[PDB]
């Protein structure tokens, strides 16, 4: 009779993707872009090229529709470095 029930946010980590998803969009549509990940990487204090900022799209892109997503996410995070 609802002892137990569900459970707080514990540590995830795959489960845990939903999270990093909307860190990396701008305004949250659902989709990032290079326009969008380009002032994300402005977080930094480093210094990226147009030519770097595509390395992220690029290897991210499974769709080759040039945008990144919660599926196209999950797969480029299956194991890239
Ligand atoms: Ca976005
Ligand atoms: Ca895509």
């Given at each position: 009779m609802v002892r137990c029930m569900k459970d707080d946010s514990?540590?995830?980590?795959?489960?845990?993707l939903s999270d990093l998803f909307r860190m990396f969009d701008?305004?949250?549509?659902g989709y990032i872009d290079l326009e969008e990940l380009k002032i994300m990487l402005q977080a930094t204090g480093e210094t990226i090229t147009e030519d770097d900022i595509e390395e992220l799209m690029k290897d991210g892109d499974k769709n080759n529709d040039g945008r990144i997503d919660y599926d196209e996410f999950l797969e480029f995070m299956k194991g890239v470095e």
């Open positions: 514990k540590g995830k980590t795959e489960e845990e701008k305004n949250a549509d």
